[PDB]
Each structure stands twice: as C-alpha cells, then as structure tokens.
Amino acid sequence: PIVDTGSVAPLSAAEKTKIRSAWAPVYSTYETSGVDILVKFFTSTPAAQEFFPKFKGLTTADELKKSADVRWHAERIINAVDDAVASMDDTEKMSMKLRNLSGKHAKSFQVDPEYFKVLAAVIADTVAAGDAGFEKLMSMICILLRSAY
Amino acid sequence: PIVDTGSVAPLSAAEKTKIRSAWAPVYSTYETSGVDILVKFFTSTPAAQEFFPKFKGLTTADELKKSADVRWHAERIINAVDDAVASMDDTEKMSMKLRNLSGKHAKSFQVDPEYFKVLAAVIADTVAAGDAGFEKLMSMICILLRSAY
Ligand code: HEM
Ligand code: HEM
C-alpha cells in the first residue's frame, strides 16, 4: 500500500510509462477529476474535515462541488501531483518543490500529516487502482510531504 | 482608465461594496470567466503572445480554450485578483502578496511590465465596465505588480 515513512525503490522506466498513460486522461479534465477526488476524501473522512476551515458549513457533495473555495483547493492539489508526474525523470526537482510544500503544510496550514496517505490513496484509486507503480509514486510524494514535520 | 505608476486614492467603503457585488457573479464561475478573459486578451494583443511560451501553436480561441495549460494559467490569474478583492480591507496583506508576485514576473517569468494594465483593462471591462471603483482596484494591482521592476 501507500507508505509515508522510510524509503521506496526508484521508479523503473516501465512504471513511469504506465503512470504517464494512466494520468493523462485524468489530468485532461483536472478541474472535474480533482473536485471529485477531494470531495470523496472529505466526505468519507470526518476526522480530517476540521483542517479545511474554509469548508465549514458545506456537508453534502452538492454544496461542496458548487463552492469556488472547494474547486480552487482541489485544482491546486491535483496540479501539485501533476508537477510530480512531469518531474519523474528529475527526482531532484521533484524533491525541491515538494519539500517547499511540506513546509507550508507544517508551518502555515498546520495540517495533521497522517492524512496525506489517505488522500493519496483516493487519488491512486481513481487514476489506476491496484497499479504498484502509481502507489510507489504516491508514496514518494507522501514521504516528501512529511519531511518538514 | 487604469494606471500603472504613481499612486491612487484609497478605496471608499461605497466603492468596495460595489466591487464585491460586481465580482461575486464572475468569480462563481471563475474557470469559465478566467479563460474568456485570458483568451480575449491573448488574441487581441499579438505583441504579448511571445510571453506565453506554453501557448506556442495555439492560435484560435477554440485551440486555446481546450488547452489545459491555458486553463490553468487563467485560473491562477483570476484567483490572484480574487485574493486582492478579498483583501481590500487589509491593504498591508494585499501588498505583500502582490509584491511577491511582482518578483516572480520580473525575475522568473521575464514578462514585459507594460502589459499588466492591458490585461487588467480586459478584466475590468468584463466585471463592471465603466466603474471607477473597480478601475481604482485594478490600478492598485498594476502598480504593485510593477514594484519589483
Ligand atoms: C497528497 C496530497 C496533497 C497535496 C499534493 C497537497 C497540495 C496542496 C497545494 C499545492 C496547496 C496550495 C498551497 C498554496 O496555495 O501555496 C495545498 C494547500 C492546502 N492543503 Fe494540501 N495537499 C495535499 C494533502 C492535503 C491534506 C490531506 C490536507 C488536509 C488534512 C491538506 C490541506 C491543505 C490546506 C488547508 C491547504 C490550504 C488551503 C487554503 O487555505 O487556500 N492538504 N495543498
Ligand atoms: C493583472 C494580471 C495579472 C495577474 C494578477 C497575474 C497573476 C499571475 C499568477 C498568480 C501567476 C501564477 C504564478 C505561480 O504559479 O507561482 C502568473 C503566472 C504567469 N504570468 Fe502573470 N499575471 C498577470 C498578468 C500577466 C501578463 C499580462 C502576462 C503576460 C505578458 C503574464 C504572464 C505570466 C506568465 C508567463 C506566467 C507563468 C505561467 C507558467 O509558466 O505556468 N501575467 N501570473
């Protein structure tokens, strides 16, 4: 499954190709996919809801999907993942960008780090459920998002 | 008209109210509005086109509107304006955020500063053409976007 500690083996050329292929369709309509992913996560994980101050009041999927706040947040998250996919060949660049992001989550947003892998799980499930390559990528992302904690 | 140098008088309580009212509808569907605004600007201002490297190839509105790159850029711009609107009562916060943005445009993106007021004009025209209050807000934004040049 998706891990958020330790280390994972590098991505093989074959895994990268599989990932790019599976990701493309999802990213094409990122504003729709991203919202579905965030909404699904938010609704099925009550404990995490307190970390989204701007969502106070919204409870049903309909309320959420109509909120510009929800859409903007979802679009930013989905695009951060997109940047990681585009940087799979440049692991150094991928790290820098995510380390910076980790700092924001730890110092400014103050979000509980345990939820990174939960949302990542939803993303993986939507893009290519069961694919070990994508799970590896998600794990890399989660490990880096926790680096500043 | 919109200016990008000097200084403009503070926004009066009345002007802020007018702005919030006119902005709300537009922001509700920011991903559509934003794209229309960016596309309109891009197509009617050939000189500026060279500053959008990722748009090379796209020439017609249809090609542009279908590009995820165009959509993402448009969504980021429209939201930067939204942040300014939401910070009208905290001029200090508005400045910090825009000064940071100015730096990116000057050091990393290398865009010609003369085009800020041209795009701002399109935004104003769409939201509330003729409103002096909105023009004042747009001028404040443009002046701050040029601060790092
Ligand atoms: C693995 C998925 C994750 C990625 C890739 C990610 C990415 C992002 C990005 C790119 C931003 C925008 C930061 C900015 O505007 O400078 C952000 C903001 C934020 N993220 Fe994360 N995030 C992730 C998971 C989470 C989780 C699980 C939570 C909640 C427990 C969370 C809560 C937040 C909050 C509260 C903000 C600030 C939103 C705002 O105030 O506008 N993120 N995240
Ligand atoms: C008054 C309107 C303007 C605002 C509020 C604005 C806002 C933004 C924002 C928020 C970003 C995202 C930066 C990031 O991701 O960190 C951005 C990127 C950018 N802006 Fe500006 N901008 C404005 C006008 C312009 C103009 C007129 C040009 C072109 C001559 C321009 C060219 C760019 C470019 C090239 C990028 C980088 C896009 C990329 O590589 O992804 N912007 N702008």
Side-chain angles (χ1 to χ4, degrees):
Chain A
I2 297 178
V3 296
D4 61 0
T5 46
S7 185
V8 303
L11 292 170
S12 66
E15 292 173 315
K16 298 180 185 179
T17 308
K18 216 295 179 63
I19 291 172
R20 298 190 219 280
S21 304
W23 182 250
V26 177
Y27 188 65
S28 298
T29 49
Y30 71 82
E31 39 275 283
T32 308
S33 314
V35 176
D36 286 335
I37 294 175
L38 184 58
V39 171
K40 194 175 300 176
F41 163 76
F42 187 83
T43 59
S44 61
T45 313
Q49 298 179 201
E50 64 175 295
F51 296 103
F52 299 84
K54 303 183 182 176
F55 294 11
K56 285 180 297 181
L58 298 319
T59 39
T60 69
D62 283 17
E63 297 176 70
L64 292 170
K65 293 184 179 183
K66 292 180 182 178
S67 177
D69 289 337
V70 179
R71 272 180 282 130
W72 181 223
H73 196 167
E75 288 157 14
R76 280 133 80 202
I77 295 180
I78 201 70
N79 270 277
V81 177
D82 179 61
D83 289 338
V85 174
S87 301
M88 285 189 285
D89 293 311
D90 193 348
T91 201
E92 173 185 41
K93 184 186 178 182
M94 188 198 288
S95 298
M96 292 195 275
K97 218 155 160 56
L98 289 169
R99 277 198 170 96
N100 185 83
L101 203 50
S102 182
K104 292 181 187 174
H105 282 81
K107 312 173 186 290
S108 312
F109 311 147
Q110 301 181 266
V111 312
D112 198 321
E114 71 169 295
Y115 300 110
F116 290 135
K117 61 177 185 300
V118 180
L119 176 53
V122 181
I123 301 177
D125 205 78
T126 300
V127 179
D131 187 56
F134 202 77
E135 279 201 351
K136 197 186 290 188
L137 206 232
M138 288 303 109
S139 293
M140 287 174 59
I141 290 179
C142 295
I143 292 169
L144 287 167
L145 282 173
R146 290 193 67 133
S147 61
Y149 286 84
Chain B
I2 297 178
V3 296
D4 60 2
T5 47
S7 184
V8 302
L11 290 170
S12 66
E15 292 174 316
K16 297 179 188 180
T17 309
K18 216 296 178 63
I19 293 172
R20 299 190 219 281
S21 304
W23 181 251
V26 176
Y27 187 65
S28 297
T29 49
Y30 72 82
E31 38 275 280
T32 309
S33 312
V35 175
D36 287 333
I37 293 175
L38 185 56
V39 171
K40 194 174 299 177
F41 162 76
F42 187 83
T43 59
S44 62
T45 315
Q49 299 180 201
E50 65 176 295
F51 296 102
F52 299 85
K54 306 182 181 178
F55 294 13
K56 284 181 296 181
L58 296 321
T59 40
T60 69
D62 284 16
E63 297 175 72
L64 291 169
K65 294 184 179 183
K66 292 180 182 178
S67 177
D69 290 336
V70 180
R71 271 181 282 131
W72 182 221
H73 196 167
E75 288 157 14
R76 280 134 80 204
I77 295 180
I78 200 70
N79 270 277
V81 179
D82 179 61
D83 289 337
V85 174
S87 301
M88 286 188 288
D89 293 309
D90 194 345
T91 200
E92 173 184 41
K93 184 186 178 181
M94 188 198 287
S95 297
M96 293 194 276
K97 218 157 160 56
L98 288 170
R99 277 197 170 97
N100 185 82
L101 203 50
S102 183
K104 292 181 187 175
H105 283 80
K107 315 174 181 294
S108 312
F109 311 146
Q110 302 180 265
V111 311
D112 198 322
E114 71 169 296
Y115 300 109
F116 290 134
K117 61 176 184 301
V118 180
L119 174 54
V122 180
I123 302 177
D125 206 78
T126 300
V127 179
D131 186 58
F134 203 76
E135 280 200 352
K136 196 187 289 188
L137 207 232
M138 288 304 107
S139 294
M140 287 173 64
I141 289 180
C142 296
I143 292 172
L144 286 168
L145 280 174
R146 291 193 64 134
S147 62
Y149 286 84

